[PDB]
Design a protein around this ligand. Structure first.
Ligand SMILES: *C(=N)[C@H]1CN(c2ccc(C(F)(F)F)nc2)C(=O)N1c1cncc2ccccc12
Ligand SMILES: *C(=N)[C@H]1CN(c2ccc(C(F)(F)F)nc2)C(=O)N1c1cncc2ccccc12
Lengths: 297, 297
């Protein structure tokens, strides 16, 4: 028993972290097969930052200007391409330790592991949840750009995130491996306000199902609220729309508690917990998906 | 900016996880050099559990009864010894991937990474804080015993924990690598109540220092409380004793805020936050050490 925010082990991703250097700027990259992915803002001088013309910048750049470094092993660039807001660098050496990988995209509420790295050296890992603001609440410093976010599907690493920007204090965003930014965010030094965020409803239902299986069920009552009626209320109460997951149905069977019983509980809890905790908390814990709690039950 | 509970990367510890099997019971072990460490309760039958006589049990056990399995590679036992509540099994094969390791012990408030494993296969990792109850709030299921907790010191893995028991819902404990249990806990199927826990004061001071550097300082006032006077108050208010750390002094210089200013704030916050959050929370966040927050600043 017990519920925590868990990360995937990091041994499949650690051998792919490289250092990428251009002029007086060093950030991180991902070395997969004969290619190195990294944020394109590595070619930005502190003068060309407010509205950078990346096509003009890539004219005065050659493969030789790029210094890719796996640990202390120098890698040689053959060519480079701009795929959205991401640079793809073809190297001469194949990454022998390339895992079985796929390039995916997370939706709000979904979770992944970030392998934080500085100077191509992994420092540690942390669990994040993509918010409805298309940002993550991470912990990143000066040289953290290019750190990747991933999810292990069986024996496959689904790479879903590349660290690019800090929009505000503790508010982070980046691109998918197609070079596309999550949300409307851009790689420019301008004021970037956040997209509207909500409490991730199905993730809070997951916390309640896990609480029931962790000997905590005070919130379960006679009351019942249909998915359709809860969705109408959620629009004006800071909650996201609920879509019944296959894992939600599995959790409902294990507890004998219908999803509709839990949606009614959420509405009551909106006006207060009244000093009662649910697994050590009086908050809307919405950072774990139904399948994140299922794996711990 | 941003503060999260981070784990150490897991690539140095993953190659040491083995499966340990005795009869109809399978748990996890740590394979370091030519030795395999695992909980001694692997030799307990469901009849001899309330008050097990382990010396009597080890008479009817031979090296051949032990089945150590790294992935699908079978390891052969030469001999076995009981070191406290831990079994040490000498194998014929050296672990070629043994990291630079040391055996240590955590004190309450200190943090480490747990690499959760089932059947000798690592499932994931999570950050824990040793509580004053000499337990951790982990997430473990049926076959999780033998999962290790560790801390990376430079290039060295300090192994500090071996999962042994679930005392209560979401309340976990185990031994150090000398086979000694944290707290007064025993490996017997009896009711085991928890040692008194407290709010880890220096860890909450660490959260406040990090909050100041994360543009949140509403709690800083004119008020000042000495270490000595705060320690007297803490005795009857659920807070642990404060010892000024070298990292606390470093954090005090970076902010210009003395430790004594923060101890006074803690006393005011004891009677309420009044709807004001400190980095998204209205609780005594005491799970990160001063040096855990220092690494993220
Ligand atoms: C990542 N290493 C740095 C650099 N960076 C950045 C963003 C935008 C631009 C440009 F040119 F406008 F497109 N250039 C550089 C950025 O935001 N960084 C970053 C990322 N995460 C966290 C932090 C914390 C502190 C300072 C910089 C951070
Ligand atoms: C760990 N794999 C299991 C087994 N276990 C256990 C504790 C004590 C004893 C004995 F004989 F009294 F000494 N035998 C077996 C135990 O507590 N386990 C455990 C550990 N963590 C979590 C869980 C969750 C569910 C069930 C068992 C758990």
């Amino acid at each position: 028993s017990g519920i925590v925010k868990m990360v995937n082990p990091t041994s499949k991703v650690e051998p792919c972290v490289v250092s990428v250097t251009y002029g007086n700027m060093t950030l991180n990259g991902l070395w997969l097969d004969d290619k190195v992915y990294c944020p394109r803002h590595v070619i930005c001088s502190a003068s060309d930052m407010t509205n950078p013309d990346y096509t003009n910048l890539l004219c005065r750049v050659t493969s030789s200007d790029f210094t890719v470094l796996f640990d202390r092993l120098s890698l040689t660039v053959m060519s480079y391409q701009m795929r959205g807001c991401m640079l793809v660098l073809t190297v001469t050496l194949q990454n022998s330790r390339t895992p079985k990988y796929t390039f995916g995209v997370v939706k709000p509420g979904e979770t992944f592991t970030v392998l934080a790295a500085y100077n191509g050296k992994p420092q540690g890992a942390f669990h994040v949840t993509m918010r409805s603001s298309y940002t993550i609440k991470g912990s990143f410093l000066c040289g953290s750009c290019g750190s990747v976010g991933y999810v292990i599907m069986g024996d496959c690493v689904k790479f879903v995130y590349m660290h690019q920007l800090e929009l505000s204090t503790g508010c982070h965003t980046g691109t998918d491996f197609n070079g596309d930014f999550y949300g409307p965010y851009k790689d420019a030094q301008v004021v970037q306000l956040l997209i509207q965020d909500y409490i991730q409803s199905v993730n809070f239902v997951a916390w309640l199902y896990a609480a029931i299986l962790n000997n905590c069920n005070w919130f379960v009552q006679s009351d019942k609220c249909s998915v359709e009626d809860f969705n109408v209320w959620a629009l004006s109460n800071g909650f996201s729309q609920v879509k019944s997951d296959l894992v939600i149905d599995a959790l409902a069977s294990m507890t004998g508690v219908s999803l509709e019983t839990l949606l009614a509980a959420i509405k009551r809890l909106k006006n207060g917990f009244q000093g009662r905790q649910i697994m050590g908390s009086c908050s809307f814990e919405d950072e774990l998906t139904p399948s994140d709690v299922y794996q711990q039950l």
